[PDB]
Swiss-Prot record, chains A, B:
Name this polypeptide is given: Cadherin-11
Species of provenance: Mus musculus (Mouse)
GO terms for biological process, alphabetical: cell-substrate adhesion; corticospinal tract morphogenesis; focal adhesion assembly; homophilic cell adhesion via plasma membrane adhesion molecules; modulation of chemical synaptic transmission; negative regulation of cell migration
Molecular function (Gene Ontology), one example: calcium ion binding
Span of the entire protein shown here: 55 to 260 of 796
SUBUNIT field: Interacts with PCDH8.
Entry text on domains: Three calcium ions are usually bound at the interface of each cadherin domain and rigidify the connections, imparting a strong curvature to the full-length ectodomain.
Record keywords, A-Z: Calcium, Cell adhesion, Cell membrane, Cleavage on pair of basic residues, Glycoprotein, Membrane, Metal-binding, Phosphoprotein, Repeat, Signal, Transmembrane, Transmembrane helix
Main location: membrane
Role summary: Cadherins are calcium-dependent cell adhesion proteins. They preferentially interact with themselves in a homophilic manner in connecting cells; cadherins may thus contribute to the sorting of heterogeneous cell types. Required for proper focal adhesion assembly. Involved in the regulation of cell migration.
Tissue-specific expression: Selectively expressed in osteoblastic cell lines, precursor cell lines of osteoblasts, and primary osteoblastic cells from calvaria, as well as in lung, testis, and brain tissues at low levels.
UniProt entry tagged with the keyword Signal: yes
Length: 208, 208
């Protein structure tokens, strides 16, 4: 009451040999004597999700890819094994496939072409670069991307989250170098120990 | 209402890199605007179980061995981030570590010494042999044992579940063979494709 408890979570991409227990239907009249038969209709019910009608345990029959389906709405019933009358009214619940970090961040193009005026002030922006990341930006952080500059410093910087590359050095007269070659990295998981990553190269002209 | 939904399941022995989402506290007033702070007290709360106080997501910080602990009772609170007053009254819930089949059935002794009269009728019992199995006899069937006879047939049989060895051949005059050597197997998972197993040897004398 007040609190909401009717949803179940399932770790995606499970490939162990024994089926994942998603959750259980269960009624408060159930003395667990066995006179009660639970019934499960709805999405994947019977196919992906399968219930033991005494215990009321639902189990996942398949490896699930949360990239394919995040949710399933299912319907619980419970009828009296003898009278066959219902013992609870039928109610919905949702199983939600928990995201796992199984996709590495990927850059929109993996060669950007930028240009910026010769004597620009330190801080002047050059180009926005962004990585899409196929995991769940909603729930996890297998989708929280951090941008680092790998090659191209001390000439240029990149904004930690925005992924914008700005000049980072004063009096950058053009004679100096013909065209600058930078490499930006994008990392999962707010870039922590573990996070999957991907890079790109930006090639910058200093305009006159 | 009627239906009971406040318990969460956690697959044991998880060793993937990303933490298992156990479940989430969540209130029906929560428009998910963020003014609501969830709080988790109880067993392993703070140690094994850890909550994001906006999303209300609980995650498992450790690999769990369901052999060590099957349950944890936890307490949910939810207070208003601004007024700090509570928004739900505090309520208990239990997370239940789901059993995995990680123990193979083991025989009480792995050399039994049995004896049975010479001319016994087919069917006469010789000895009960039982395997303990360290997994959850309650929930799964990683603990449902089946007994087969491996060596010793056609002289003797073994009862599929009881594990009792009985003679299975008429007129078994003793002159014949000095002492009979049988091997019994015990298999997990009602002995299906997969099930872990273990054996023993029974050494039978035919008495005069
Ligand atoms: Ca996936
Ligand atoms: Ca994923
Ligand atoms: Ca990712
Ligand atoms: Ca274990
Ligand atoms: Ca186990
Ligand atoms: Ca076992």
């Amino acid at each position: 009451s007040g609190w909401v408890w009717n949803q179940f979570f399932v770790i995606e991409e499970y490939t162990g040999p024994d089926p994942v227990l998603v959750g259980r239907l269960h009624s408060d009249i159930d003395s667990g004597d066995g006179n009660i038969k639970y019934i499960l209709s709805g999405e994947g019910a019977g196919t992906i999700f399968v219930i033991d009608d005494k215990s009321g345990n639902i189990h996942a029959t398949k490896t699930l890819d949360r990239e394919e389906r995040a949710q399933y709405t299912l319907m619980a019933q419970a009828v009296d094994r003898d009278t066959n009358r219902p013992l609870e009214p039928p109610s919905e619940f949702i199983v939600k496939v928990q995201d796992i970090n199984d996709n590495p961040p990927e850059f929109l193009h993996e060669i950007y072409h930028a240009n910026v005026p010769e004597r620009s002030n330190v801080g002047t922006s050059v180009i926005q670069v962004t990585a899409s990341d196929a995991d769940d930006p909603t729930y996890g952080n297998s989708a929280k991307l951090v941008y680092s500059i790998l090659e191209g410093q001390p000439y240029f910087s990149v904004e930690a989250q925005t992924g914008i590359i700005r000049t980072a050095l004063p009096n950058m007269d053009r004679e100096a170098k013909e065209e600058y070659h930078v490499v930006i990295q994008a990392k999962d998981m707010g870039g922590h120990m573990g996070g999957l990553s991907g890079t790109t190269k930006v090639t910058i002209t200093l305009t006159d």
